[PDB]
């Protein structure tokens, strides 16, 4: 109770240090545009849902836009890999927003089979395909590359970071769609796995006037 009160500032901090982190130049991309989406679907569901807990209206528009966005990226990232050119989906910056805007109203005009099954039924295989065919390539690479030099193993971990964010939101909201507090848990898990996995580490940890390893 009064002890878990520290779990709200977590859904009002880690999701803001992220929104601001995105809103730096280099951190602006389609991937970190949808991951920055799950920030408003964690902050709003923490400064508007967690406090008072219309209150059950934004409770659905929030969790029905998540596993929906999770369905988005799984496909976007795919279209990026299955793509004949460089790694970075074709979803333009504006059409990413135009596509992002339509993820909310349809999340508002909205069921466990419509807003949960459907979005997770394919999301787990559109990604499965990816995490898999991302392996054949991973080393269809020239062995010599990296040991004699004179998609790579890096972008192979960026799908590790996005591979657990989609792999944690499943073990957190499945026992519920099959415990309502466990679902709230994935509110301080994303800006937590983004530290020891993706670039975010420095992006936001040093934004607070150089955290610690700032050549301390």
């Amino acid at each position: 109770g009064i002890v878990m009160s520290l779990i709200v500032l977590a859904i009002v901090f880690g999701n803001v240090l992220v929104i601001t982190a995105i809103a730096f130049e280099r951190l602006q991309t389609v991937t970190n545009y949808f991951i920055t989406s799950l920030a408003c679907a964690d902050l709003v569901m923490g400064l508007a849902v967690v406090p008072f807990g219309f209150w059950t209206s934004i409770d659905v528009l929030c969790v029905t836009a998540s596993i929906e966005t999770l369905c988005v990226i799984a496909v976007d990232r795919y279209f990026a890999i299955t793509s004949p050119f460089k790694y970075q989906s074709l979803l333009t910056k504006n059409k990413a927003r135009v596509i992002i805007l339509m993820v909310w109203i349809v999340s508002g005009l909205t069921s466990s089979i419509v807003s949960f099954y459907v979005p997770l039924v394919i999301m787990v295989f559109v990604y499965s395909r990816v995490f898999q065919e991302a392996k054949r390539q991973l080393q269809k690479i020239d062995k010599s590359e990296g040991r004699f030099h004179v998609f790579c193993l890096k972008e192979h971990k960026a799908l590790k970071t996005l591979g657990i964010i989609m792999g944690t939101f499943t073990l957190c909201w499945l026992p519920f769609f099959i415990l309502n507090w466990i679902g709230y848990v994935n509110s301080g898990f994303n800006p937590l796995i983004y530290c020891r996995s993706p670039d975010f580490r420095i992006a936001f940890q040093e934004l607070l006037c150089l955290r610690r390893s700032s050549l301390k």
Partner: antibody, heavy 113, light 108 residues
Framework: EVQLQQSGAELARPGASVKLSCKAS????????INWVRQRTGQGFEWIGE????????DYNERFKDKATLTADKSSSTAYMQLSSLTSEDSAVYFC??????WGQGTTLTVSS | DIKMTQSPSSMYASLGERVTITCKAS??????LSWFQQKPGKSPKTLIY???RLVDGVPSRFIGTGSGQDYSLTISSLDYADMGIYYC?????????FGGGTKLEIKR
């Protein structure tokens, strides 16, 4: 001016544990994995494993699977190798290569009472 | 894991002649083989990788050429400074396995 610095001499009591280092300085650390090959006295080479500083992937050779544990330091631009429960037969020269291109200096580790 | 024999072992060539060692692995490394030299009291200096792609700096008299399951390091016009023990390494798959090295001496 390319080089992976190494201790050259390391004494350790049987059962203990040394932690060899290798300060590479002459290229971009994270652009090459660096393996750690062991070459006992007399002759012969036995790869202990390879770690990719950039990522984190550390593919150990079965044999040293639980024996050694590689690790890299992006900042210091030096990498390490944790050798636990050292035994008389763990004594040899431990090399730190840049993926078999440029080898290190070498560390004459020796486990002895 | 993946045995890689390496004939010869011992070998005495005189100055000027073209000496040669031949390496043959168990599997089929896709030209993912390398040749280096160990000189007493020094760390190994690599000469060739990708079965034939000379390293930068290695003298132009070294030649690696094999394919699929058998290769061979070779030098035409053996130079005095060319005394030591060359070994072939395969990095096609884990665990990287070394040859056993053939050692070459010069008849004086």
């Amino acid at each position: 001016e390319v080089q992976l610095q190494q201790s050259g001499a390391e004494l350790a009591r049987p059962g203990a544990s040394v932690k060899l280092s290798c300060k590479a300085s002459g290229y971009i650390f994270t652009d090459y994995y660096i393996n750690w090959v062991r070459q006992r006295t007399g002759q012969g080479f036995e790869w202990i494993g390879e770690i990719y500083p950039g990522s984190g992937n550390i593919d150990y050779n079965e044999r040293f699977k639980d024996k050694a544990t590689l690790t890299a330091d992006k900042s210091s631009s030096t990498a390490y190798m944790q050798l636990s429960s050292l035994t008389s037969e763990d004594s040899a020269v431990y090399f730190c290569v840049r993926g078999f291109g440029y080898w290190g200096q070498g560390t004459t580790l020796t486990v002895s009472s | 894991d993946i045995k890689m024999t390496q004939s010869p072992s011992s070998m005495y060539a005189s100055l000027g002649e073209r000496v040669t060692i031949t390496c043959k692995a168990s599997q089929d490394i896709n030209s993912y083989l390398s040749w280096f030299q160990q000189k007493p009291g020094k760390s190994p200096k690599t000469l060739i990788y990708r079965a034939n792609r000379l390293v930068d700096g290695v003298p132009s008299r070294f030649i690696g050429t094999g394919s699929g399951q058998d290769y061979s390091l070779t030098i035409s016009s053996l130079d005095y400074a060319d005394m030591g023990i060359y070994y072939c390494l395969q990095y096609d798959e884990f665990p990287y396995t070394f040859g056993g090295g053939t050692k070459l001496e010069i008849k004086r």
